[PDB]
Amino acid sequence: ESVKEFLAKAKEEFLKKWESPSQNTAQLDHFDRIKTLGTGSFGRVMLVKHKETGNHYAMKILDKQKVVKLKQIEHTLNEKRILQAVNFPFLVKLEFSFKDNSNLYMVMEYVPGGEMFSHLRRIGRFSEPHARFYAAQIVLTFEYLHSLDLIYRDLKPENLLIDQQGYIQVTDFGFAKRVKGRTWTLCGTPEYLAPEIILSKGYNKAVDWWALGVLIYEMAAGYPPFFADQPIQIYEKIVSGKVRFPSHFSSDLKDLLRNLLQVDLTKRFGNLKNGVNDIKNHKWFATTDWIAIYQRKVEAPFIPKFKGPGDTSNFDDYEEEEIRVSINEKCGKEFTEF
Ligand SMILES: Nc1ncnc2cccnc12
């Protein structure tokens, strides 16, 4: 009942913000630009510093004209509307949003420890206790999101930031969506796509649980279970029903992964009548204190090395390009609700 009442209150608070989203809560010249942290086909993420408070933030900047061209309008409205409405210990916090003639802006707490991707590649692979610590946070985050009728759809090591206490902060809600029933958009990263996405079926929250299986495999092995030079070759392996496990995997880990990487979505863990409890009660999680994880009372496997809230040493170097704002408004109608 404690879990039921927790999720009931979580949905109440989410729906209130979902129905009346915040808008236009800062502007660009409130911030100093420090460094580019990441870049993509229609946007980038910048470390900025608020000029009055001195607080650091990660500012995601989306070029409206490129969003329209790459057909991401609904997705970018999804991302901001969901992000301003959620509240959970392992979700990055959105502090401000706003738009101008050229760009959409989402200003989030800056997580200085870097992406899980970098740490995993630097160490090679995580021990099973280490992987289990991160996986538990994802299980709880998906329990939270799915109860709000949200699907995340972009689980991968690059989107999991390690914070100052060594806990996960999920970033990038670019593909997240509120869904009652099924949805159909082809999106995600090829290595992490469930078979039903590849086969163009109407799919549901089960694709997140599949992605968790890929993520746990990758954390524990150092590479994802379906790998190839071309995406088409990755897709053939995903739909085949065949995964090979390293010998060092425990029997409990292999058993959990066979049930998360179940190609038949009606037999996949997290999508059965017991929902998430088939995962939480699995023998691989027998040592996990779910409440202690939620309360951030478990000592983390490692704390990232960084010097302070403005340290960027755990992120990589990108060409520094202008943040240009046109003298004319672009795509005003398409982003009216942002
Ligand atoms: N919130 C963030 N904090 C730190 N680095 C990031 C990189 C990409 C996206 N978001 C962030």
DSSP 207-230: HHHHHHHHHHHHHHHSS-SS--SS
Ligand 1 — pocket residues by CB below 6 A?
Answer: 37-38, 45, 58, 92, 108-111, 161, 171
Contact 8, 148 (CB under 8 A): no
38 forms beta bridges with 45
Tokens read off for 9 = 């209150």
Contact 50, 30 (CB under 8 A): yes
| Three-class DSSP category at 137 | helix
Give the angle 302-131-205 at the CA atoms, nearest 5°. 125
Helical (H) or strand (E) element with 65: helix 64-69
Nearest CA to ligand 1 atom 6: 58
For the question of residue 154 being annotated catalytic, the response is yes
Looking at ligand 1, which atom is closest to the CA of residue 108?
A: 1
Given the residues 154, 172, 208, 278, the one annotated as active site: 154
Tokens read off for 64 = 């409206």
Tokens read off for 170 = 């999920």
- What are the start-end ranges of the E strands in 67-201? 94-99, 103-109, 150-151, 160-162, 168-170, 177-178
Looking at ligand 1, which atom is closest to the CA of residue 315?
A: 5
Looking at ligand 1, which atom is closest to the CA of residue 92?
A: 1
Q: Report whether 158 belongs to an annotated binding site.
A: yes
Contact 183, 203 (CB under 8 A): yes
Tokens read off for 17 = 């913000």
Q: Report whether 45 belongs to an annotated binding site.
A: yes
Tokens read off for 154 = 């972009």
Contact 309, 112 (CB under 8 A): yes
Helical (H) or strand (E) element with 136: helix 128-147
| Residue showing tokens 């109608």 | 333
Instruction: Compute, in angstroms, the gap from residue 45 CA to the centroid of ligand 1.
Output: 7
Q: Taking the chain, what is the end-to-end CA distance rounded to the nearest angstrom?
A: 37
Gap between the Cα atoms of 106 and 83, Å rounded = 9
Contact 262, 279 (CB under 8 A): no
CB within 8 Å of 10: residues ≥ 6 apart = 87, 88, 144, 147, 148
Instruction: Compute, in angstroms, the gap from residue 93 CA to the centroid of ligand 1.
Output: 10
- The values of phi and psi at residue 85, to 5°, are -105, -15
Instruction: Compute, in angstroms, the gap from residue 162 CA to the centroid of ligand 1.
Output: 10
What sign does the CA torsion over 318, 338, 87, 259 have? negative
Contact 82, 120 (CB under 8 A): no
| Three-class DSSP category at 57 | strand
| Three-class DSSP category at 64 | helix
Q: Report whether 310 belongs to an annotated binding site.
A: no
Residue (of 148, 60, 149) closest to 106 by Cα position: 60
Gap between the Cα atoms of 338 and 334, Å rounded = 9
Gap between the Cα atoms of 224 and 214, Å rounded = 6
Instruction: Compute, in angstroms, the gap from residue 268 CA to the centroid of ligand 1.
Output: 31
Gap between the Cα atoms of 254 and 111, Å rounded = 32
Nearest CA to ligand 1 atom 11: 58
Q: Report whether 43 belongs to an annotated binding site.
A: yes
Q: Report whether 41 belongs to an annotated binding site.
A: yes
Residue (of 141, 168, 165) closest to 157 by Cα position: 168
Instruction: Compute, in angstroms, the gap from residue 90 CA to the centroid of ligand 1.
Output: 13
| Three-class DSSP category at 69 | helix
Gap between the Cα atoms of 193 and 216, Å rounded = 14
Nearest CA to ligand 1 atom 8: 45
